[PDB]
Amino acid sequence: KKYFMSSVRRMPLNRAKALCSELQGTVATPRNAEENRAIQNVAKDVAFLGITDQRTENVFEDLTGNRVRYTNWNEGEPNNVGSGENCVVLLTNGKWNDVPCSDSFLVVCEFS
Amino acid sequence: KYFMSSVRRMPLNRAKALCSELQGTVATPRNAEENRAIQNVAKDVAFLGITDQRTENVFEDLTGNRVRYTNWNEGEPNNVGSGENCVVLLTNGKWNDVPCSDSFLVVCEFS
Ligand SMILES: OC[C@H]1O[C@@H](O)[C@H](O)[C@@H](O)[C@H]1O
Ligand SMILES: OC[C@H]1O[C@@H](O)[C@H](O)[C@@H](O)[C@H]1O
Ligand SMILES: [Ca+2]
Ligand SMILES: [Ca+2]
Ligand SMILES: [Ca+2]
Ligand SMILES: [Ca+2]
Ligand SMILES: [Cl-]
């Protein structure tokens, strides 16, 4: 099964990726609501998910460039505000928000 | 318990910080079955969450609990040189005490 673990510190997505890969894992990418809730259980605050629309705007893929199916966007999201929001975080209510990849949040890693 | 190995080598302090970052700890085998599981996740020599930094020749886990199960390689522990207060799991599954300042892979443990 997949196991999820949350970081203690906040960091931008690239450092988040590096953290998870250090232990040979990836940044958590929920494929359904059960997994979304399992990530909620470990995330004590807003945290990064392994999803971005960095390739093509409004097309969300996991970190391996694989287009995602399941989404749980917060109302009004994704909205790509300002200079752009191409990363995704799981809010404390379990819904997602697109955010700048350079902003810092906790990170949930996934292993299997 | 779930065990994960790092890809890079680092001294024990950095090793502890890494596992703690994801709210886990440096792996401490409590029996032969756990020892094997950690050995398998580690592709090379890796630190275990055991030291005798507090009291020489008194090996305990990172929370100060004296370890019962041990799997020392023959001749170990030997505290050579100016001291070896950290512990690594060799590629043959046996343990060796080493300087905490030396770099090895790290296997983290999670519950
Ligand atoms: O900077 C704060 C903003 O962040 C955006 O990502 C979000 O869509 C907005 O609703 C607002 O929360
Ligand atoms: O530095 C090399 C030495 O490392 C020690 O920890 C070990 O006990 C010795 O047998 C030798 O391998
Ligand atoms: Ca975007
Ligand atoms: Ca947004
Ligand atoms: Ca010693
Ligand atoms: Ca030794
Ligand atoms: Cl030492």
PDB file of C-alpha atoms and ligand atoms in Angstrom:
ATOM      1  CA  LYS A   1       0.000   0.000   0.000  1.00  0.00           C
ATOM      2  CA  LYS A   2       1.120   3.622  -0.064  1.00  0.00           C
ATOM      3  CA  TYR A   3       2.454   5.199   3.107  1.00  0.00           C
ATOM      4  CA  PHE A   4       2.365   8.955   3.670  1.00  0.00           C
ATOM      5  CA  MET A   5       4.642  11.035   5.917  1.00  0.00           C
ATOM      6  CA  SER A   6       4.626  14.788   6.587  1.00  0.00           C
ATOM      7  CA  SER A   7       7.647  17.055   6.914  1.00  0.00           C
ATOM      8  CA  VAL A   8       8.155  19.341   9.907  1.00  0.00           C
ATOM      9  CA  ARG A   9       9.522  22.330   7.970  1.00  0.00           C
ATOM     10  CA  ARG A  10       8.143  24.353   5.056  1.00  0.00           C
ATOM     11  CA  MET A  11       9.942  24.575   1.718  1.00  0.00           C
ATOM     12  CA  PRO A  12       9.307  25.383  -1.975  1.00  0.00           C
ATOM     13  CA  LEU A  13       8.354  22.504  -4.297  1.00  0.00           C
ATOM     14  CA  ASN A  14      11.844  21.748  -5.621  1.00  0.00           C
ATOM     15  CA  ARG A  15      13.230  21.247  -2.116  1.00  0.00           C
ATOM     16  CA  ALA A  16      10.083  19.239  -1.353  1.00  0.00           C
ATOM     17  CA  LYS A  17      10.860  16.975  -4.315  1.00  0.00           C
ATOM     18  CA  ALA A  18      14.472  16.612  -3.167  1.00  0.00           C
ATOM     19  CA  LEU A  19      13.400  15.786   0.379  1.00  0.00           C
ATOM     20  CA  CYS A  20      11.092  12.945  -0.681  1.00  0.00           C
ATOM     21  CA  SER A  21      13.539  11.572  -3.264  1.00  0.00           C
ATOM     22  CA  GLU A  22      16.264  11.472  -0.603  1.00  0.00           C
ATOM     23  CA  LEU A  23      14.376   8.526   0.923  1.00  0.00           C
ATOM     24  CA  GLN A  24      13.430   7.253  -2.530  1.00  0.00           C
ATOM     25  CA  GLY A  25       9.847   8.462  -2.280  1.00  0.00           C
ATOM     26  CA  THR A  26       7.830  11.063  -4.149  1.00  0.00           C
ATOM     27  CA  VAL A  27       5.674  14.039  -3.199  1.00  0.00           C
ATOM     28  CA  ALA A  28       2.206  12.704  -2.296  1.00  0.00           C
ATOM     29  CA  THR A  29      -0.228  12.476  -5.220  1.00  0.00           C
ATOM     30  CA  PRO A  30      -3.719  11.331  -4.157  1.00  0.00           C
ATOM     31  CA  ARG A  31      -5.428   9.220  -6.847  1.00  0.00           C
ATOM     32  CA  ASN A  32      -8.807   9.061  -5.056  1.00  0.00           C
ATOM     33  CA  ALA A  33     -10.645  10.392  -1.960  1.00  0.00           C
ATOM     34  CA  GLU A  34      -9.412   7.655   0.384  1.00  0.00           C
ATOM     35  CA  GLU A  35      -5.819   8.640  -0.376  1.00  0.00           C
ATOM     36  CA  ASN A  36      -6.762  12.319  -0.161  1.00  0.00           C
ATOM     37  CA  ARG A  37      -8.074  11.691   3.360  1.00  0.00           C
ATOM     38  CA  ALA A  38      -5.004   9.606   4.286  1.00  0.00           C
ATOM     39  CA  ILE A  39      -2.828  12.602   3.364  1.00  0.00           C
ATOM     40  CA  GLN A  40      -5.149  14.820   5.436  1.00  0.00           C
ATOM     41  CA  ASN A  41      -4.501  12.564   8.432  1.00  0.00           C
ATOM     42  CA  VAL A  42      -0.755  13.286   8.280  1.00  0.00           C
ATOM     43  CA  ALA A  43      -0.740  16.937   7.176  1.00  0.00           C
ATOM     44  CA  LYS A  44      -1.151  19.265  10.185  1.00  0.00           C
ATOM     45  CA  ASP A  45      -1.113  22.335   7.960  1.00  0.00           C
ATOM     46  CA  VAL A  46      -1.226  23.243   4.246  1.00  0.00           C
ATOM     47  CA  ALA A  47       1.116  20.970   2.356  1.00  0.00           C
ATOM     48  CA  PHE A  48       2.399  20.386  -1.181  1.00  0.00           C
ATOM     49  CA  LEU A  49       1.029  17.576  -3.370  1.00  0.00           C
ATOM     50  CA  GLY A  50       3.008  16.192  -6.324  1.00  0.00           C
ATOM     51  CA  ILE A  51       0.972  17.913  -9.026  1.00  0.00           C
ATOM     52  CA  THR A  52       1.717  20.865 -11.345  1.00  0.00           C
ATOM     53  CA  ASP A  53       0.515  22.481 -14.557  1.00  0.00           C
ATOM     54  CA  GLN A  54       4.003  23.712 -15.320  1.00  0.00           C
ATOM     55  CA  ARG A  55       4.003  22.029 -18.751  1.00  0.00           C
ATOM     56  CA  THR A  56       0.736  23.448 -20.085  1.00  0.00           C
ATOM     57  CA  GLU A  57      -1.421  25.874 -18.135  1.00  0.00           C
ATOM     58  CA  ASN A  58      -4.558  24.271 -16.669  1.00  0.00           C
ATOM     59  CA  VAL A  59      -3.370  20.746 -17.517  1.00  0.00           C
ATOM     60  CA  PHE A  60      -2.395  19.101 -14.220  1.00  0.00           C
ATOM     61  CA  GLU A  61       0.119  16.259 -14.146  1.00  0.00           C
ATOM     62  CA  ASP A  62       1.963  14.438 -11.374  1.00  0.00           C
ATOM     63  CA  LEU A  63       5.712  15.060 -10.989  1.00  0.00           C
ATOM     64  CA  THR A  64       6.483  12.376 -13.607  1.00  0.00           C
ATOM     65  CA  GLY A  65       4.509  14.269 -16.269  1.00  0.00           C
ATOM     66  CA  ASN A  66       1.568  11.934 -16.012  1.00  0.00           C
ATOM     67  CA  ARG A  67      -1.814  13.671 -16.346  1.00  0.00           C
ATOM     68  CA  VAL A  68      -3.941  13.254 -13.211  1.00  0.00           C
ATOM     69  CA  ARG A  69      -7.560  12.123 -13.151  1.00  0.00           C
ATOM     70  CA  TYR A  70      -8.833  12.670  -9.586  1.00  0.00           C
ATOM     71  CA  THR A  71      -8.916  16.296  -8.396  1.00  0.00           C
ATOM     72  CA  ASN A  72     -10.375  17.879  -5.225  1.00  0.00           C
ATOM     73  CA  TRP A  73     -10.109  21.625  -5.954  1.00  0.00           C
ATOM     74  CA  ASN A  74     -11.385  24.140  -3.430  1.00  0.00           C
ATOM     75  CA  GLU A  75     -14.221  26.293  -4.788  1.00  0.00           C
ATOM     76  CA  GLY A  76     -12.798  28.953  -7.079  1.00  0.00           C
ATOM     77  CA  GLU A  77      -9.664  26.908  -7.742  1.00  0.00           C
ATOM     78  CA  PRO A  78      -7.553  26.504  -9.742  1.00  0.00           C
ATOM     79  CA  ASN A  79      -7.326  30.244 -10.475  1.00  0.00           C
ATOM     80  CA  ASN A  80      -3.682  30.859 -11.485  1.00  0.00           C
ATOM     81  CA  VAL A  81      -3.486  34.229  -9.670  1.00  0.00           C
ATOM     82  CA  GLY A  82      -0.833  36.881 -10.220  1.00  0.00           C
ATOM     83  CA  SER A  83       2.370  35.955 -12.014  1.00  0.00           C
ATOM     84  CA  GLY A  84       1.137  32.367 -11.952  1.00  0.00           C
ATOM     85  CA  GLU A  85       0.308  29.463  -9.670  1.00  0.00           C
ATOM     86  CA  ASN A  86       1.538  26.167 -11.061  1.00  0.00           C
ATOM     87  CA  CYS A  87       1.888  24.000  -7.955  1.00  0.00           C
ATOM     88  CA  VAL A  88      -0.787  22.439  -5.757  1.00  0.00           C
ATOM     89  CA  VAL A  89      -1.323  22.229  -1.991  1.00  0.00           C
ATOM     90  CA  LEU A  90      -3.819  20.320   0.135  1.00  0.00           C
ATOM     91  CA  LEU A  91      -5.632  22.869   2.320  1.00  0.00           C
ATOM     92  CA  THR A  92      -6.534  21.963   5.920  1.00  0.00           C
ATOM     93  CA  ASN A  93     -10.136  21.247   4.835  1.00  0.00           C
ATOM     94  CA  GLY A  94      -8.858  18.595   2.415  1.00  0.00           C
ATOM     95  CA  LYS A  95      -9.510  20.624  -0.743  1.00  0.00           C
ATOM     96  CA  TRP A  96      -6.787  21.773  -3.138  1.00  0.00           C
ATOM     97  CA  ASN A  97      -5.459  25.209  -4.040  1.00  0.00           C
ATOM     98  CA  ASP A  98      -3.031  26.053  -6.843  1.00  0.00           C
ATOM     99  CA  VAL A  99      -0.075  28.069  -5.517  1.00  0.00           C
ATOM    100  CA  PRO A 100       3.270  29.474  -6.697  1.00  0.00           C
ATOM    101  CA  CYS A 101       5.885  26.710  -6.884  1.00  0.00           C
ATOM    102  CA  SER A 102       8.340  29.061  -5.209  1.00  0.00           C
ATOM    103  CA  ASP A 103       6.201  29.537  -2.044  1.00  0.00           C
ATOM    104  CA  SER A 104       6.893  27.415   1.032  1.00  0.00           C
ATOM    105  CA  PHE A 105       4.586  24.803   2.537  1.00  0.00           C
ATOM    106  CA  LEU A 106       4.908  21.526   4.423  1.00  0.00           C
ATOM    107  CA  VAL A 107       5.382  18.509   2.178  1.00  0.00           C
ATOM    108  CA  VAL A 108       3.814  15.094   2.357  1.00  0.00           C
ATOM    109  CA  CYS A 109       5.943  12.293   0.920  1.00  0.00           C
ATOM    110  CA  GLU A 110       4.583   9.034  -0.483  1.00  0.00           C
ATOM    111  CA  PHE A 111       6.237   5.609  -0.422  1.00  0.00           C
ATOM    112  CA  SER A 112       5.034   2.130  -1.391  1.00  0.00           C
TER     113      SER A 112
ATOM    114  CA  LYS B   1       7.412  -0.271  11.071  1.00  0.00           C
ATOM    115  CA  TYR B   2       8.378   0.921   7.610  1.00  0.00           C
ATOM    116  CA  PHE B   3      12.008   1.297   6.555  1.00  0.00           C
ATOM    117  CA  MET B   4      13.409   3.591   3.849  1.00  0.00           C
ATOM    118  CA  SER B   5      17.016   4.048   2.751  1.00  0.00           C
ATOM    119  CA  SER B   6      18.681   7.273   1.653  1.00  0.00           C
ATOM    120  CA  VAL B   7      20.655   7.427  -1.580  1.00  0.00           C
ATOM    121  CA  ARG B   8      23.417   9.680  -0.296  1.00  0.00           C
ATOM    122  CA  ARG B   9      25.888   9.282   2.558  1.00  0.00           C
ATOM    123  CA  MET B  10      26.069  11.637   5.539  1.00  0.00           C
ATOM    124  CA  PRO B  11      27.349  11.688   9.168  1.00  0.00           C
ATOM    125  CA  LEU B  12      25.031  10.585  11.993  1.00  0.00           C
ATOM    126  CA  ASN B  13      23.861  14.122  12.891  1.00  0.00           C
ATOM    127  CA  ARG B  14      22.682  14.747   9.347  1.00  0.00           C
ATOM    128  CA  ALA B  15      21.222  11.193   9.310  1.00  0.00           C
ATOM    129  CA  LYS B  16      19.152  11.931  12.425  1.00  0.00           C
ATOM    130  CA  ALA B  17      17.966  15.233  10.962  1.00  0.00           C
ATOM    131  CA  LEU B  18      16.861  13.518   7.768  1.00  0.00           C
ATOM    132  CA  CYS B  19      14.728  10.858   9.460  1.00  0.00           C
ATOM    133  CA  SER B  20      13.353  13.392  11.958  1.00  0.00           C
ATOM    134  CA  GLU B  21      12.354  15.674   9.115  1.00  0.00           C
ATOM    135  CA  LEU B  22       9.701  13.150   8.078  1.00  0.00           C
ATOM    136  CA  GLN B  23       8.845  12.417  11.724  1.00  0.00           C
ATOM    137  CA  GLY B  24      10.672   9.105  11.815  1.00  0.00           C
ATOM    138  CA  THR B  25      13.967   7.990  13.353  1.00  0.00           C
ATOM    139  CA  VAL B  26      17.161   6.219  12.267  1.00  0.00           C
ATOM    140  CA  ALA B  27      16.284   2.487  12.014  1.00  0.00           C
ATOM    141  CA  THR B  28      16.908   0.319  15.064  1.00  0.00           C
ATOM    142  CA  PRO B  29      16.481  -3.424  14.505  1.00  0.00           C
ATOM    143  CA  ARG B  30      14.859  -5.080  17.543  1.00  0.00           C
ATOM    144  CA  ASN B  31      15.297  -8.628  16.234  1.00  0.00           C
ATOM    145  CA  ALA B  32      16.706 -10.676  13.350  1.00  0.00           C
ATOM    146  CA  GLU B  33      13.654 -10.161  11.138  1.00  0.00           C
ATOM    147  CA  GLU B  34      13.865  -6.369  11.394  1.00  0.00           C
ATOM    148  CA  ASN B  35      17.633  -6.590  10.882  1.00  0.00           C
ATOM    149  CA  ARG B  36      17.073  -8.432   7.591  1.00  0.00           C
ATOM    150  CA  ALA B  37      14.392  -5.956   6.463  1.00  0.00           C
ATOM    151  CA  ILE B  38      16.750  -3.006   7.047  1.00  0.00           C
ATOM    152  CA  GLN B  39      19.660  -4.819   5.393  1.00  0.00           C
ATOM    153  CA  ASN B  40      17.539  -5.315   2.263  1.00  0.00           C
ATOM    154  CA  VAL B  41      16.441  -1.685   1.978  1.00  0.00           C
ATOM    155  CA  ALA B  42      20.085  -0.576   2.382  1.00  0.00           C
ATOM    156  CA  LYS B  43      22.193  -1.047  -0.782  1.00  0.00           C
ATOM    157  CA  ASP B  44      25.398  -0.339   1.134  1.00  0.00           C
ATOM    158  CA  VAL B  45      26.635   0.157   4.712  1.00  0.00           C
ATOM    159  CA  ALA B  46      24.150   2.316   6.618  1.00  0.00           C
ATOM    160  CA  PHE B  47      23.790   3.855  10.091  1.00  0.00           C
ATOM    161  CA  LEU B  48      21.446   2.340  12.677  1.00  0.00           C
ATOM    162  CA  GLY B  49      19.817   4.394  15.460  1.00  0.00           C
ATOM    163  CA  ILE B  50      22.196   3.056  18.099  1.00  0.00           C
ATOM    164  CA  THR B  51      25.117   4.701  19.919  1.00  0.00           C
ATOM    165  CA  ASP B  52      27.209   4.461  23.095  1.00  0.00           C
ATOM    166  CA  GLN B  53      27.857   8.202  23.148  1.00  0.00           C
ATOM    167  CA  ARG B  54      26.427   8.587  26.679  1.00  0.00           C
ATOM    168  CA  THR B  55      28.286   5.690  28.264  1.00  0.00           C
ATOM    169  CA  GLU B  56      31.102   3.794  26.548  1.00  0.00           C
ATOM    170  CA  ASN B  57      30.208   0.206  25.620  1.00  0.00           C
ATOM    171  CA  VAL B  58      26.589   0.832  26.672  1.00  0.00           C
ATOM    172  CA  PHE B  59      24.644   0.736  23.423  1.00  0.00           C
ATOM    173  CA  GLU B  60      21.239   2.379  23.366  1.00  0.00           C
ATOM    174  CA  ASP B  61      18.763   3.649  20.753  1.00  0.00           C
ATOM    175  CA  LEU B  62      18.335   7.369  19.944  1.00  0.00           C
ATOM    176  CA  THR B  63      15.775   7.760  22.755  1.00  0.00           C
ATOM    177  CA  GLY B  64      18.134   6.484  25.448  1.00  0.00           C
ATOM    178  CA  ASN B  65      16.758   2.943  25.606  1.00  0.00           C
ATOM    179  CA  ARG B  66      19.323   0.208  26.084  1.00  0.00           C
ATOM    180  CA  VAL B  67      19.256  -2.226  23.178  1.00  0.00           C
ATOM    181  CA  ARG B  68      18.695  -5.922  23.810  1.00  0.00           C
ATOM    182  CA  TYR B  69      19.087  -7.607  20.422  1.00  0.00           C
ATOM    183  CA  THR B  70      22.555  -7.030  18.907  1.00  0.00           C
ATOM    184  CA  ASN B  71      24.194  -8.476  15.786  1.00  0.00           C
ATOM    185  CA  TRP B  72      27.834  -7.467  16.078  1.00  0.00           C
ATOM    186  CA  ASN B  73      30.326  -8.567  13.453  1.00  0.00           C
ATOM    187  CA  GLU B  74      33.176 -10.668  14.900  1.00  0.00           C
ATOM    188  CA  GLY B  75      35.639  -8.462  16.745  1.00  0.00           C
ATOM    189  CA  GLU B  76      33.012  -5.753  17.206  1.00  0.00           C
ATOM    190  CA  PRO B  77      32.306  -3.502  18.966  1.00  0.00           C
ATOM    191  CA  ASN B  78      35.951  -2.446  19.306  1.00  0.00           C
ATOM    192  CA  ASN B  79      35.927   1.381  19.683  1.00  0.00           C
ATOM    193  CA  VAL B  80      39.095   1.755  17.523  1.00  0.00           C
ATOM    194  CA  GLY B  81      41.190   4.846  16.985  1.00  0.00           C
ATOM    195  CA  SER B  82      40.031   7.813  19.038  1.00  0.00           C
ATOM    196  CA  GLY B  83      36.624   6.199  19.441  1.00  0.00           C
ATOM    197  CA  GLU B  84      33.695   4.688  17.567  1.00  0.00           C
ATOM    198  CA  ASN B  85      30.378   5.589  19.143  1.00  0.00           C
ATOM    199  CA  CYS B  86      27.982   5.066  16.256  1.00  0.00           C
ATOM    200  CA  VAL B  87      26.782   1.859  14.603  1.00  0.00           C
ATOM    201  CA  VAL B  88      26.440   0.717  10.996  1.00  0.00           C
ATOM    202  CA  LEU B  89      24.817  -2.333   9.460  1.00  0.00           C
ATOM    203  CA  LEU B  90      27.294  -3.940   7.063  1.00  0.00           C
ATOM    204  CA  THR B  91      26.293  -5.509   3.720  1.00  0.00           C
ATOM    205  CA  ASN B  92      26.479  -8.964   5.350  1.00  0.00           C
ATOM    206  CA  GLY B  93      23.874  -7.946   7.966  1.00  0.00           C
ATOM    207  CA  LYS B  94      26.312  -7.746  10.900  1.00  0.00           C
ATOM    208  CA  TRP B  95      27.084  -4.555  12.822  1.00  0.00           C
ATOM    209  CA  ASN B  96      30.199  -2.462  13.253  1.00  0.00           C
ATOM    210  CA  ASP B  97      30.760   0.486  15.581  1.00  0.00           C
ATOM    211  CA  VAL B  98      32.142   3.502  13.661  1.00  0.00           C
ATOM    212  CA  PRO B  99      32.977   7.194  14.236  1.00  0.00           C
ATOM    213  CA  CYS B 100      29.768   9.249  14.342  1.00  0.00           C
ATOM    214  CA  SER B 101      31.560  11.834  12.203  1.00  0.00           C
ATOM    215  CA  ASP B 102      32.001   9.387   9.261  1.00  0.00           C
ATOM    216  CA  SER B 103      29.536   9.253   6.331  1.00  0.00           C
ATOM    217  CA  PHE B 104      27.293   6.295   5.482  1.00  0.00           C
ATOM    218  CA  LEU B 105      23.817   5.751   4.063  1.00  0.00           C
ATOM    219  CA  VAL B 106      20.924   6.073   6.494  1.00  0.00           C
ATOM    220  CA  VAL B 107      17.893   3.847   6.893  1.00  0.00           C
ATOM    221  CA  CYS B 108      14.954   5.632   8.524  1.00  0.00           C
ATOM    222  CA  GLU B 109      12.172   3.848  10.408  1.00  0.00           C
ATOM    223  CA  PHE B 110       8.510   4.912  10.577  1.00  0.00           C
ATOM    224  CA  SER B 111       5.477   3.479  12.344  1.00  0.00           C
TER     225      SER B 111
HETATM  226  O1  LIG C   1      -2.236  34.646  -1.812  1.00  0.00           O
HETATM  227  C1  LIG C   1      -3.519  34.251  -1.347  1.00  0.00           C
HETATM  228  C2  LIG C   1      -4.364  33.701  -2.478  1.00  0.00           C
HETATM  229  O2  LIG C   1      -3.752  32.457  -2.905  1.00  0.00           O
HETATM  230  C3  LIG C   1      -4.376  31.928  -4.082  1.00  0.00           C
HETATM  231  O3  LIG C   1      -3.708  30.770  -4.442  1.00  0.00           O
HETATM  232  C4  LIG C   1      -5.838  31.615  -3.790  1.00  0.00           C
HETATM  233  O4  LIG C   1      -6.459  31.108  -4.954  1.00  0.00           O
HETATM  234  C5  LIG C   1      -6.569  32.881  -3.325  1.00  0.00           C
HETATM  235  O5  LIG C   1      -7.908  32.561  -2.980  1.00  0.00           O
HETATM  236  C6  LIG C   1      -5.847  33.478  -2.113  1.00  0.00           C
HETATM  237  O6  LIG C   1      -5.957  32.591  -1.003  1.00  0.00           O
HETATM  238  O1  LIG C   2      38.552   2.046   9.817  1.00  0.00           O
HETATM  239  C1  LIG C   2      38.574   0.656   9.529  1.00  0.00           C
HETATM  240  C2  LIG C   2      38.223  -0.138  10.760  1.00  0.00           C
HETATM  241  O2  LIG C   2      36.896   0.263  11.178  1.00  0.00           O
HETATM  242  C3  LIG C   2      36.586  -0.278  12.469  1.00  0.00           C
HETATM  243  O3  LIG C   2      35.347   0.188  12.871  1.00  0.00           O
HETATM  244  C4  LIG C   2      36.575  -1.797  12.401  1.00  0.00           C
HETATM  245  O4  LIG C   2      36.282  -2.317  13.675  1.00  0.00           O
HETATM  246  C5  LIG C   2      37.936  -2.322  11.928  1.00  0.00           C
HETATM  247  O5  LIG C   2      37.867  -3.733  11.755  1.00  0.00           O
HETATM  248  C6  LIG C   2      38.285  -1.664  10.594  1.00  0.00           C
HETATM  249  O6  LIG C   2      37.337  -2.086   9.626  1.00  0.00           O
HETATM  250 CA    CA C   3      -1.167  27.383 -13.308  1.00  0.00          CA
HETATM  251 CA    CA C   4      -5.072  29.568  -6.346  1.00  0.00          CA
HETATM  252 CA    CA C   5      32.287   3.588  21.567  1.00  0.00          CA
HETATM  253 CA    CA C   6      34.537  -0.938  14.973  1.00  0.00          CA
HETATM  254 CL    CL C   7      32.291   8.497  17.552  1.00  0.00          CL
END
